[PDB]
Design a protein around this ligand. Structure first.
Ligand SMILES: *[C@@H]1O[C@H](CO)[C@@H](O[C@@H]2O[C@H](CO)[C@@H](O[C@@H]3O[C@H](CO)[C@@H](O)[C@H](O)[C@@H]3O)[C@H](O)[C@H]2NC(C)=O)[C@H](O)[C@H]1NC(C)=O
Ligand SMILES: *[C@@H]1O[C@H](CO)[C@@H](O[C@@H]2O[C@H](CO)[C@@H](O[C@@H]3O[C@H](CO)[C@@H](O)[C@H](O)[C@@H]3O)[C@H](O)[C@H]2NC(C)=O)[C@H](O)[C@H]1NC(C)=O
Lengths: 322, 322
């Protein structure tokens, strides 16, 4: 009767809020048209598919998504890196990476994606960044699960691509090689090579044809680009917006407590400010709520025995509207 | 005049909220006493110090903090692992680990801590978990920064310690060994050993005397223990508390939009419910706000050229009170 509609009304409220959320995120005053193009082309479907199932691991405005495939194997130059059975090389032309992203500042997230298909043994791999000529800098670690069905893998390589877009040669790239562990005893050193158990190399990742390694990019488009953990505080913002008000709390002066031996006081902060769609969560009631929270360790005695305990979420480091 | 006091009143409000926050987090109806014990003993000061500067990287109720030093080197057994110049071994007695934590379920966070002092060259290290007898299972990776002043290091080892407390032998431990990289070409294999550049072993980490490797533990005490990313939804909670109401939004039926080619609709969810101190943020205005948020990739045409973009924070996966 009443309550039923009373909730259908609230749902209908956010539908008009999301209608404003999507348009404001796109910097669009009006909904556009369908476009000139039956079914969509497979170049954007593969790009949309690549984005639908994000693996592993947040600006408000929308981000343009583009992918750039690496230069084909047995094409251009593989002369330097021949006969490395346990290492897969990937190289990208910076001219076509700059074609996707006009300026390094626009890039917000870049992730290299590969296609693994092995199902029997796990593979421990490593990722390296090329420096100068044939000098390699370690990036990240990754273990591979024995999945019968192929699953995509991603590597967060944003900071590297931003340096590539800004300067350096036109040919930059990565190197996915096997992880080894070595423990030495009594003048004898054992090397346990892990990952790339099959010498074919083509058994671990897909390197020929379509579905080859590419570099997925997420950047702000240039039309949007115009205008547009770090602590936030109310004095530095110079605005009435939601911020962090610092409040030192003494246990002796404020709470009147004497039982906490350490610390004598701590910087408990709180949020404050009104949240006003052109002016992020698009909820039915935006609030000034904290985002970042640190714990607070304290010391006190319980009878004869002291206790050192940590209280979670006692200090506010950053607020936000939602 | 007015506004000044009007803000001092709000600050005084949260002081009584934090007064309830700290006591409710400790399950204390009243503030306790100072205790039987001038300056505090150095055993809890080192334990309080260990907690004050947490490095690297959230239950509501307080967590008991205890540390357990590893068995002394050149003491008990080091016979098996002698002459491993690039590997530091650490072993803990499970009887005294069970002395700190009575049941594996109580343990919420465990972190092994070491003391590094090198300043010249960076050290790339690895961490391993002992399996059976002299079988090692990789845990995590870590690079070490050349700091002139010593800095503490931590390793999240919670899942391992919980398995140790539940079953297994009484002597379990870890192994911190150097990371090596190996790239093979033309029947020649190069091994670049990184970390532990000095053969002294005692140059990288502190292994004798006090400030030796210990295992920091954070668990719920047994007196508190009685009673007390996974998606949350309003139908499953069976309560009026703040939860997630699912709402499928069709672009054709609800928004009337036809320009988004893919997807045809998405599961935009919203938060709802009243937040009621015995009944987490302890702010001046608790709100039902979302915690987990996923992006939403969409596809649409701009004139002749299509665009595939991702909109951040469009789907709500979990709400919370703050
Ligand atoms: C990208 O992912 C989409 C789905 O997210 C894939 O779309 C799929 O395309 C196939 C066409 O080969 C569809 O099969 C069709 O099934 C219907 C029955 O529903 C049948 O009548 C048709 O004759 C055809 O067999 C499939 O349904 C469709 N997936 C979904 C969920 O509708 C697409 O193929 C992927 N593209 C790439 C390049 O990975
Ligand atoms: C654990 O950390 C605490 C600080 O977080 C350390 O407390 C420090 O203890 C020394 C005593 O050796 C204090 O020095 C004192 O300075 C005052 C002047 O303020 C002087 O009058 C005294 O004669 C003495 O020299 C030092 O101030 C104090 N730190 C602070 C911030 O007050 C403690 O030593 C650490 N313990 C361990 C085991 O690491």
């Amino acid at each position: 009767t009443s309550k039923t509609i009373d909730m259908e009304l609230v749902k209908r409220k956010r539908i008009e809020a999301i209608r404003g959320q999507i348009l404001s995120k796109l910097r669009l005053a009006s909904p556009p048209s369908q476009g000139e193009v039956g079914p969509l082309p497979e170049a954007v479907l593969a790009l949309y598919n690549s984005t639908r199932d994000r693996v592993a691991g947040a600006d408000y405005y929308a981000k343009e998504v583009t992918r750039v495939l690496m230069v084909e194997t047995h094409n251009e130059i593989y002369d330097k890196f021949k006969q490395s059975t346990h290492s897969i090389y990937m190289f990208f032309q910076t001219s076509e990476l700059r074609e996707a992203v006009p300026e390094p500042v626009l890039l917000s997230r870049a992730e290299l994606r590969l296609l693994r298909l092995k199902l029997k043994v796990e593979q421990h791999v490593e990722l390296y960044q090329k420096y100068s000529q044939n000098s390699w800098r370690y990036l990240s670690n990754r273990l591979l699960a024995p999945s019968d069905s192929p699953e995509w893998l991603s590597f967060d390589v944003t900071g590297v691509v931003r340096q590539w877009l800004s300067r350096g040669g036109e040919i930059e790239g990565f190197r996915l090689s096997a992880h080894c562990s070595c423990d030495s005893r009594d003048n004898t050193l054992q090397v346990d090579i892990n990952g790339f158990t099959t010498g074919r190399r083509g058994d671990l990742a897909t390197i020929h044809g379509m579905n080859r390694p590419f570099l997925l990019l997420m950047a702000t488009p240039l039309e949007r680009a115009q205008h547009l953990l770090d602590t936030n505080y109310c004095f530095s913002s110079t605005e009435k917006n939601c911020c962090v008000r610092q409040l030192y709390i003494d246990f002796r002066k404020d709470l009147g407590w004497k039982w906490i031996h350490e610390p004598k006081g701590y910087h408990a902060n709180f949020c404050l400010g009104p949240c006003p769609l052109a002016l992020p969560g698009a909820s039915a009631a935006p609030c000034c709520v904290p985002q970042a929270l640190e714990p607070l360790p304290i010391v006190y005695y319980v009878g004869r025995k002291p206790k050192v305990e940590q209280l979670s979420n006692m200090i506010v480091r950053s607020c936000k509207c939602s």
